[PDB]
Amino acid sequence: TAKKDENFSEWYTQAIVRSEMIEYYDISGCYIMRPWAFHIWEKVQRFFDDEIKKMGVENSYFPMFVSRHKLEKFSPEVAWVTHYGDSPLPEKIAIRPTSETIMYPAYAKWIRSHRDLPLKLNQWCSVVRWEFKQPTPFLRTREFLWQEGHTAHATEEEAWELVLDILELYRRWYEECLAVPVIKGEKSEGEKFAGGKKTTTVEAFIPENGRGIQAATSHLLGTNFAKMFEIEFEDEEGHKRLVHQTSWGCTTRSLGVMIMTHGDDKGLVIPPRVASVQVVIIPILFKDENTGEILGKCRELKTMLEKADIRVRIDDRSNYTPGWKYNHWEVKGVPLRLELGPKDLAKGTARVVRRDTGEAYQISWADLAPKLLELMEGIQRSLFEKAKARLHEGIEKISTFDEVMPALNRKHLVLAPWCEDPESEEQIKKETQKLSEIQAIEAGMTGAMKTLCIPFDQPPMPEGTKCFYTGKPAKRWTLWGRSY
């Protein structure tokens, strides 16, 4: 009903509700994750889990509660448990917004010698961040599922290499699983995690509202938390030294980003590598046909495709028309549908329709498994490459501040030479907010532009390039935009 290029927020709501991905809940900012979305979470979780276990990372489970003393060592976002029944607790306890203060006292106890390092742990769980602003399903919620990984190393260089390895895993999570392009970069001093040394990030872009969104994060913590929690190891000489730490996380926000990137006016489009149903088989069931024969062949084709590890469902319900089923599985984003009626059976072929473009194919039964494998890889790659083209066309390279507001009004990001002085970033935030409010009055949700990241992939910097806002000597190209 709602078109993606008109009212994007109602289009998004419709897409995720009518596909049965989410259900609303009476506590604002929390949503139920129904199986159609949860299956995709399980897929990207299995991918990430397999990859970090190759790195020596092991899973664990730390408590969801943290004592006041351990935590206070943001604060309006922490939900506090204060009573058990109607009786009060001696000291209130907080629900984890993140688990640094829960895990790191244990780390301090576990780590004694250089032979105890590196220590690499992860956990899958939910965290709670209690903001009063308007939530967005998947993207910004008061409770969300995530993983958080936390490691400790004998040297800064080894920790930093792990930070980059994890960030490459997040790039693969988005680009290789979800077909969403991202930009690797480092956060500005004002945007980085306060408790760390350097925050690396992958950033995505939502063309319809022009907003950048942080996709995942990998922090070089250095020795800051090691001094805070007294996490030290002994070298083989016997001298005690602080450990060098990392932490990293990624959330169900990734599902929302995937949904927004690939959806169209008919609803969801799910990349084949994460679709729980890759091929839906729809028999044509005329009253005047050998229905048993048609259903039998559908079952044979399902078996044949599953031997190729294709995930198949047959929708053989007699009480819905094929047109109804076409729309039903399009709305849910199944990437391929296979139609089989008496004429196809007589020709020994099946008709296959791809969800992204609607192109149709007639495929022999012998060619079905390899041709469908090839088509799923083509769909996955085309979804990614068109998203990547939209990303590149959503970024304007600029040289002075005069170009900021026009580009923002085109719902674009800007890539600008920046001197990286923190004071300049907050001046830029405040000025672009003011200019946005003026433009809003002339037109008849926040408008501020901030840094999204300083990209790893730096374009050439001609000698003597000036900062686009301060006029001081520029240091690096920086990606800015309105943001989630």
Ligand X SMILES: O=C(C[C@H]1NCCC[C@@H]1O)Cn1cnc2ccccc2c1=O
Ligand Y SMILES: Cc1cc(N2CC[C@@](C#N)(C3(C)CC3)C2=O)cc(C(=O)NCc2cc(F)cc(-c3cnn(C)c3)c2)n1
Query: How distant, in Å, are the alpha carbons of 198, 219, 225, 246, 297 from that of 154?
Result: 18, 16, 14, 12, 61
- Which residues within the stretch 231-250 sit at the binding site for ligand Y (CB under 6 A)? 249-250
Site string for ligand X, 230-269 (x = CB under 6 A): -----------------xxx--------------------
Select the binding partner of residue 459 from ligand X, a second copy, ligand Y, none (C-beta < 5 to 8 A, by kind): none
Q: Answer yes or no: are the C-beta atoms of 128 and 235 closer than 8 Å.
A: no
Among residues 417, 412, 400, the alpha carbon closest in space to that of 458 is found at 417
Select the binding partner of residue 247 from ligand Y, ligand X, a second copy, none (C-beta < 5 to 8 A, by kind): ligand X
Measured from the CB of residue 77, what is the shortest distance to ligand X in angstroms? 5
Is residue 324 a contact residue for a second copy (CB under 8 A)? no
Breaks (C-N over 2.5 A) in the chain follow: 73, 444
Distant-in-sequence contacts of 460-463, Cβ < 8 A, 24+ apart: 461/417
Measured from the CB of residue 250, what is the shortest distance to ligand Y in angstroms? 5
Among residues 446, 464, 459, the alpha carbon closest in space to that of 415 is found at 459
Is residue 148 a contact residue for ligand X (CB under 6 A)? yes
Site string for a second copy, 19-58 (x = CB under 8 A): ----x-xxx--xxxxxx--xx-xx---------------x
Select the binding partner of residue 128 from ligand Y, ligand X, a second copy, none (C-beta < 5 to 8 A, by kind): a second copy
**In angstroms, rounded to a whole number, what is the distance separating the alpha carbons of residues 92 and 78?**
12
Cα 138 from chain centre: 9
What would the DSSP string read from start to end of 309-343?
T--EEE---TTS-HHHHHHHHHHTT-SEEEEE-HH
Task: Say which DSSP state 113 is in.
Answer: B
161 is in an annotated binding site: yes
What would the DSSP string read from start to end of 379-448?
HHHHHHHHHHHHHHHTEEE-SSGGGHHHHHHTT-EEEEEE---HHHHHHHHHHHHHHHHHHHHHH-----
165 is in an annotated binding site: yes
Q: Which is nearer to a second copy, 255 or 404 (CB)?
A: 255
Q: How many residues bind ligand X (CB under 6 A)?
A: 13
Select the binding partner of residue 133 from a second copy, ligand Y, ligand X, none (C-beta < 5 to 8 A, by kind): ligand Y
Measured from the CB of residue 127, what is the shortest distance to ligand Y in angstroms? 8
Binding site listing for Ca(2+)? 161, 165
Binding region for a second copy (CB under 8 A): 23, 25-27, 30-35, 38-39, 41-42, 58-67, 70, 75-85, 87, 92-93, 95, 105-106, 109-110, 115, 121, 125-126, 128, 130, 132, 143, 145, 319
Binding region for ligand X (CB under 6 A): 74, 77-78, 97-98, 100, 129, 148, 193, 217, 247-249
